[PDB]
Amino acid sequence: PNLSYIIGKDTWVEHWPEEDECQDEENQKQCQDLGAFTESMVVFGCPN
């Protein structure tokens, strides 16, 4: 159970603001788009 995830050149990370942080007009759209990617991947998967 000692697995550890190393941050490397293949890893990608971006902050997801909390609910109250989402109300800024530019972070509004980020919480919009980060939420669409959430529902998109799980239900439709990939055509690849």
Binding site: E19, D20, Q23, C31, Q32, A36, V43, F44
Partner: protein, 210 residues
């Protein structure tokens, strides 16, 4: 038969609020004379109230606006799924308005997605609907209000599977038709789309102040 009277006014209370307007109050007692064996009752009020103004602005919580218009019903990495048995999705957005002065932010999902078929501009058959319920007498308060009911060419929606079951977490999503179809129907009264009729409303009351 002793006549009572008011005593000295006590210390005034500080302004209990740090913003906008508040209320301070002064308090007195009828303790020095005191009505004995009857008499009166000090005559007046033993509590004065006063408004205090901090002259500094204060909050209000933002409210959700009405949901916008549904996006076009599309499928990822596919072209138009119109007039086809291909269930897609569409999104909708809200806007938080009215939040001022460090007020509480809007609570809830500002985006909404649901599954859909696409009948945008799809040629389909139709049948005349029955007479709709009589609308409101318009214009109210205006000269000669009239109601209006109508029959319209209702499209025959295709019998597609209303529910598509996906796995992952075993999620089943309702599918709703989207789009403005082209309902085909025989002419009724020289009209193909909608035929209505108006009737004046009888004994109209005047609009006055409540």
């Amino acid at each position: 038969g002793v006549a009572g009277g008011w005593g000295p006014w006590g210390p005034v209370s500080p302004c209990p609020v740090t913003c906008g307007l508040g209320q301070t109050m002064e308090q007195r007692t009828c303790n020095h004379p005191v009505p004995q064996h009857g008499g009166p009752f000090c005559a007046g009020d033993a509590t004065r109230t006063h408004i205090c103004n901090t002259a500094v602005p204060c909050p209000v919580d933002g409210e959700w606006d009405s949901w916008g218009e549904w996006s076009p019903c599309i499928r990822r990495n596919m072209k138009s799924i119109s007039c086809q048995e291909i269930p897609g999705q569409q999104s909708r957005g809200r806007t938080c308005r009215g939040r001022k002065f460090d007020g509480h932010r809007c609570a809830g999902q500002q985006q909404d997605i649901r599954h859909c078929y696409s009948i945008q501009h799809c040629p389909l058959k139709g049948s005349w609907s029955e007479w709709s319920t009589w609308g409101l007498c318009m214009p109210p308060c205006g000269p000669n209000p009239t109601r209006a009911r109508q029959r319209l060419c209702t499209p025959l929606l295709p019998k597609y599977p209303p529910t598509v079951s996906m796995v992952e977490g075993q999620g089943e999503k309702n599918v709703t038709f989207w789009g403005r179809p082209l309902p085909r129907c025989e002419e009724l009264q020289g009209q193909k789309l909608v035929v209505e009729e108006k009737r004046p409303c009888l004994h109209v009351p005047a609009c006055k102040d409540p």
